Amino acid sequence: LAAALAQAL
Ligand SMILES: *C(=O)c1ccc(-c2ccc(C(=O)OCC)cn2)nc1
Ligand SMILES: *NNC(=O)c1ccc(-c2ccc(C(N)=O)cn2)nc1
Ligand SMILES: C[C@H](Cl)c1ccccc1
Numbered sequence: 001l002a003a004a005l006a007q008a009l
């Protein structure tokens with residue numbers, strides 16, 4: 001989940 005969201009940055 002972390003990576004899936006972190007892509008924003
Ligand atoms: C949520 O974005 C997320 C993405 C990816 C993973 C995850 C957990 C474990 C592995 C792993 O063991 O890969 C070995 C090649 C990969 N990706 N967790 C949560
Ligand atoms: N929020 N993160 C990003 O926008 C982001 C853009 C590009 C990359 C990235 C990572 C690795 C490579 C490579 N060729 O190994 C290229 N671009 N990460 C994050
Ligand atoms: C549940 C999280 Cl969002 C996830 C699923 C599949 C691939 C990467 C992340």
Ligand SMILES: C[C@H](Cl)c1ccccc1
Nearest residue numbers: 001002003004005006007
């Ligand atoms: C992105 C993944 Cl499917 C997720 C959504 C909402 C709560 C927890 C995980």
